[PDB]
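Consider the following assembly input.
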Amino acid sequence: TETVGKFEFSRKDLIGHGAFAVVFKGRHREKHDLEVAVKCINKKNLAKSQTLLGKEIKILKELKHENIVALYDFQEMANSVYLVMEYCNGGDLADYLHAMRTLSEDTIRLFLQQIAGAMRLLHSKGIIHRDLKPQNILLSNPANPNSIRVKIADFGFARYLQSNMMAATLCGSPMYMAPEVIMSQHYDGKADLWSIGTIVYQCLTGKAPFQASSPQDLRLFYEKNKTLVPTIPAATSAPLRQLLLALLQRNHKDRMDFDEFFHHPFLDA
Ligand SMILES: COc1cc2nc(-c3cc(F)ccc3O)nc(N[C@@H]3CNC[C@H]3C(C)(C)O)c2cc1OC
Ligand SMILES: [Mg+2]
Ligand SMILES: [Mg+2]
Ligand code: NA
């Protein structure tokens, strides 16, 4: 049993591990029924893991929203970092997708309304996430209609971007990266909108809108194709088709902006 502030966990109770983090289930030390996830350094990638967990603290401690994973506490030291977060008992969207194969438009709508809500807060705070993908979207069953909650997680790559500035760090997951990102160009908040478009397309069809055999091939594809048009099934509703075409614009100046996304007809009741 290890303690972190008012919280504890055992390393027997593994939730999962990736290259840059290990997560365990724990609990509050007084209120044993308050469950938490405790994210810890992955010592196989020590320096990068430590950096990303520190960055995640700096961002998440400023965000309180039902659709963003809550940071209850954290502990940063010279050689260790812990985040104590709300436990998301539903697992991630990637695993849900693996079982469902595809989602109904009504489900896509429910999830995307919640994602949009989170993105409204990020945008108002001047934060870009930079690693939106199904593996970083968690599900939580907290009474009320459609109570399942989506939560954006894994803010290790996130940054503040001043509204008259552009980012240039190459980070993210190639399959979900906007063309401008993977082509090593300057980018802004609309790169995340491409990632979202990609997620929605994947929920709808079970596939990526532009498949390649590698990151290098995908880059070359974007470089050579000045116009990108994803294949949308004929059965797709008109509002969802329009949303996807507007999110999955190659050129960020032609891509849908935040205000249009937040008020898109697809997202209406
Ligand atoms: C109930 O089942 C699960 C709960 C999970 N909760 C969190 C989780 C992560 C947080 F950062 C905070 C709260 C949480 O609950 N994270 C999981 N997996 C993470 C997220 N997707 C990839 C994977 C990893 C470790 C590579 O990042 C869970 C996987 C689960 O099942 C496989
Ligand atoms: Mg991130
Ligand atoms: Mg951009
Ligand atoms: Na802030």
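Residues 2-86 form a domain with the Phosphorylase Kinase; domain 1 fold (CATH 3.30.200.20). Ask yourself how this observation constrains the way the partners meet.
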